[PDB]
Amino acid sequence: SGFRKMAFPSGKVEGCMVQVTCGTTTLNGLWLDDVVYCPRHVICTSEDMLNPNYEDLLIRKSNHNFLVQAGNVQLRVIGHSMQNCVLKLKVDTANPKTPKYKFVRIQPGQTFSVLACYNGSPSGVYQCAMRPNFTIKGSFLNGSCGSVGFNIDYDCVSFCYMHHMELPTGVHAGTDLEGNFYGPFVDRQTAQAAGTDTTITVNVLAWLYAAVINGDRWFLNRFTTTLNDFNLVAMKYNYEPLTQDHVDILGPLSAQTGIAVLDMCASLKELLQNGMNGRTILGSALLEDEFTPFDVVRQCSGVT
Amino acid sequence: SGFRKMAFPSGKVEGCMVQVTCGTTTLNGLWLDDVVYCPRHVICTSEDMLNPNYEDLLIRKSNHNFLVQAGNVQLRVIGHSMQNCVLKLKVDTANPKTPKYKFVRIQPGQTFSVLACYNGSPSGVYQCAMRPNFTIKGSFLNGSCGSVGFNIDYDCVSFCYMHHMELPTGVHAGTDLEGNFYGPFVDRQTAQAAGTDTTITVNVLAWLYAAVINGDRWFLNRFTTTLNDFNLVAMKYNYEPLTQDHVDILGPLSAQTGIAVLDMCASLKELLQNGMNGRTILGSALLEDEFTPFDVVRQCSGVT
Numbered sequence: 001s002g003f004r005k006m007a008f009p010s011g012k013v014e015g016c017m018v019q020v021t022c023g024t025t026t027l028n029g030l031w032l033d034d035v036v037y038c039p040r041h042v043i044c045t046s047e048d049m050l051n052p053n054y055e056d057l058l059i060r061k062s063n064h065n066f067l068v069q070a071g072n073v074q075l076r077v078i079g080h081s082m083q084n085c086v087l088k089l090k091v092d093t094a095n096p097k098t099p100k101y102k103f104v105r106i107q108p109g110q111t112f113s114v115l116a117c118y119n120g121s122p123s124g125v126y127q128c129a130m131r132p133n134f135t136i137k138g139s140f141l142n143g144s145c146g147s148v149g150f151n152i153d154y155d156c157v158s159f160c161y162m163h164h165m166e167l168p169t170g171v172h173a174g175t176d177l178e179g180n181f182y183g184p185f186v187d188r189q190t191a192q193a194a195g196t197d198t199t200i201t202v203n204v205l206a207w208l209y210a211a212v213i214n215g216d217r218w219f220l221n222r223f224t225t226t227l228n229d230f231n232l233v234a235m236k237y238n239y240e241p242l243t244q245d246h247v248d249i250l251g252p253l254s255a256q257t258g259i260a261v262l263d264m265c266a267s268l269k270e271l272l273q274n275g276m277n278g279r280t281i282l283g284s285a286l287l288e289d290e291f292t293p294f295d296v297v298r299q300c301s302g303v304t
Numbered sequence: 305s306g307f308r309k310m311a312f313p314s315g316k317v318e319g320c321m322v323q324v325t326c327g328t329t330t331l332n333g334l335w336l337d338d339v340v341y342c343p344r345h346v347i348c349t350s351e352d353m354l355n356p357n358y359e360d361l362l363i364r365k366s367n368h369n370f371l372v373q374a375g376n377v378q379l380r381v382i383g384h385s386m387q388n389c390v391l392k393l394k395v396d397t398a399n400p401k402t403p404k405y406k407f408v409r410i411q412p413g414q415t416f417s418v419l420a421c422y423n424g425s426p427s428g429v430y431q432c433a434m435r436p437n438f439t440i441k442g443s444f445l446n447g448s449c450g451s452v453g454f455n456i457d458y459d460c461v462s463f464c465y466m467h468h469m470e471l472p473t474g475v476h477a478g479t480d481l482e483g484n485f486y487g488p489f490v491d492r493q494t495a496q497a498a499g500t501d502t503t504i505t506v507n508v509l510a511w512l513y514a515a516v517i518n519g520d521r522w523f524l525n526r527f528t529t530t531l532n533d534f535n536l537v538a539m540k541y542n543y544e545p546l547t548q549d550h551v552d553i554l555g556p557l558s559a560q561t562g563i564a565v566l567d568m569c570a571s572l573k574e575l576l577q578n579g580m581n582g583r584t585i586l587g588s589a590l591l592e593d594e595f596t597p598f599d600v601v602r603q604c605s606g607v608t
C-alpha cells in the first residue's frame with residue numbers, strides 16, 4: 001500500500017549521458033550505439049539564438065569542433081548531421097553501456113521519467129506528464145538541455161523526450177529523439193504561445209482508482225452519470241472530454257475494485273463541482289493527473 | 305525554473321540489488337563489497353512472523369540455505385550473521401558494481417530516495433521524508449522488503465534506510481543498514497503504535513523559498529513574527545517548533561531571496577491560519593514538507 005509519483009530506475013539512462021560542447025556552449029548528449037544525440041542549439045551562441053539559421057551555423061562546424069566527453073573519456077567524432085532540431089554525432093566507439101532501446105513519440109497525457117543532467121552528469125529523476133498542450137512542467141536550469149524523458153518495459157528503454165527550452169512562462173518544451181518538437185514550438189529565443197491546457201481526465205480517474213485501492217474512499221458516492229453528462233462537467237472545468245477509449249483503458253481498474261467507470265466519473269463530477277472540502281486524496285489536496293491507468297496498474301501490482 | 309520532488313539517480317543503487325531467498329520467503333538484498341544485507345525476516349515463514357525468535361530461527365539455517373541471486377549469477381554464501389534486524393551474508397565475490405558508499409543513520413525530517421525493488425529487480429524510484437515519528441509514507445507491496453533508501457554526494461551513496469514492514473495503518477517502517485529500526489518498531493506481525501506525527505516546519509519554509517525563487521509569490525505578506533509567536537501557531541497546527549538551528553540552515557535561502565526567515569515564517573503563519581484559499585504553490589494545494597533547505601539549494605542551483 002501507499003501511492004507515490006514514482007519514476008523509472010534511471011540506471012540504463014545514466015550510462016548513456018555525455019557532455020557535448022561546441023565553441024563555448026555546453027549541454028547534454030545521449031550516447032546510444034555509435035551515435036550521440038543532442039539539441040541542435042549546442043552550435044549557437046547567445047546572439048545566434050534570437051533568430052538562428054541552423055543550416056548556416058552548422059556549415060561552419062567540423063567533426064573536431066564537437067567535443068563529446070563521457071565522464072573521463074573523450075569520444076572521437078567521425079560524422080555529424082542535423083535531423084530536425086537534433087544533432088547526430090557519429091562517434092568511432094559504440095557505447096558499452098547502451099541498453100536495449102527504442103525511439104518513441106508519446107501522446108499528450110502520457111507520462112515519463114526525466115533524468116535531469118548538467119554538463120553530462122545526472123542530477124535527479126522525476127516523473128512527469130506530457131501536458132495536453134505538449135509542454136512539460138519540469139525542473140530545468142541552464143545546462144539541462146539534452147536531458148531526456150523515457151519509459152522502460154523490462155529491459156527496453158523507450159526514449160520519448162529531449163529537453164530543448166524554457167518558455168517565457170517557465171514551462172518546458174522539447175522534441176522526440178528524431179528532433180521533432182512536441183507542440184508548435186521552435187528552437188528560437190522568441191515568445192511562443194503554448195495552447196490552452198486541460199486536465200487529463202483519464203489519469204485523474206486512474207488516480208481515483210489508486211486512492212480506492214489504497215484506502216482513500218471518502219469521495220465515493222451513491223451516484224452515477226453518463227459520458228454525455230460527465231463531459232458537460234469536464235467542459236465547464238477544462239477537463240479532457242472522456243471517450244469510450246478512455247473508459248476501455250480504465251477497465252482493469254474498474255474490474256479490480258468493482259466500481260464501474262461511470263460511477264467513478266460521478267465521484268469526479270462531485271469533486272469538480274464541490275472541491276475537496278479541505279480533505280486529501282493520496283496526500284494531495286488537488287486532483288492529480290500525472291498517473292496514467294497503466295502507471296496505476298504497474299504500481300498497484302509491483303511490476304519491475 | 306520549475307520545482308519537482310526529485311529523487312537521486314538510482315543507477316549506483318540498482319547495481320547493488322540482489323534477490324535473497326531462504327526456504328520459501330523471497331525478498332531484496334543489498335550487495336556491497338563481499339557482503340549482502342537484507343531484513344532478518346527472510347528466515348521466517350508466515351506462522352513465524354506472529355512472535356519470531358530470530359536467534360532460534362537463524363540457528364536452523366546454514367550458509368547453503370540462503371540463496372542469493374544477482375540477476376542471472378548465483379552468489380556463493382560463505383558466512384552469515386545477524387546484526388540487530390538485518391542479516392549479513394558474506395559472499396565469496398565482491399560486487400564489481402559497488403559504488404563508494406557509507407552507512408548513515410538519518411534524522412527525522414531528513415529526506416531520501418527509495419529504490420523500490422521486487423525479487424531483486426528495481427521497479428521505481430521516489431523521494432520521501434523520514435516522518436518526525438520515524439515512519440515513511442512509501443509505496444511498498446509484498447516482496448519490497450529489503451528495498452533501500454539513500455542519498456548521494458557526488459560519487460558517494462549514503463545508505464540510510466532498508467524497508468522492513470507495513471504497519472496496520474499502511475505506513476512504512478524500516479531500519480538503518482546496521483539493522484536498528486527507526487522508531488519504536490519491532491519486526492513482528494503485531495499492531496504497533498507510531499507516535500503522533502508533526503509537519504516538518506523547516507522543510508515547509510524551504511519549500512516556500514523554492515516557490516518564491518520560481519515565481520509563486522502570492523503568499524508573501526507585509527507581516528513579520530518572532531520565533532515565540534510563530535511557535536504558538538506551529539503548536540496549534542501540529543508543526544515542529546522552529547528553532548534557531550532551523551533558522552540557521554534556512555540562511556542560504558533567506559540570503560538569495562532577500563526575505564528574512566521570520567518574514568517567511570509570517571507568510572507560513574497566515575497560510576496556516578487562513579488556508580490556501582483555493583490556490584496552489586508549486587502545483588500543490590497543501591503545505592509541502594518533503595524538501596529540506598539543502599534539497600531546495602541543490603535543485604535551485606543544479607548540483608549533480
Ligand SMILES: Cc1cnncc1NC(=O)Cc1cccc(Cl)c1
Pocket residue numbers: 041049140141142143144145164165166167186187188189190305
Ligand atoms: C534557461 C533554461 C532553463 N531551463 N531549461 C532550458 C533553458 N535554456 C534555454 O531555453 C536555452 C534556449 C533558448 C532559446 C531557445 C532554445 Cl531551443 C533554447
Ligand SMILES: Cc1cnncc1NC(=O)Cc1cccc(Cl)c1
Pocket residue numbers: 001345353444445446447448449468469470471490491492493494
Ligand atoms: C505486505 C507488505 C507491504 N508493504 N511493505 C511490506 C510488507 N510486508 C511486511 O510487512 C511483512 C512483515 C510482516 C511483519 C513484520 C515484518 Cl518485519 C514484515
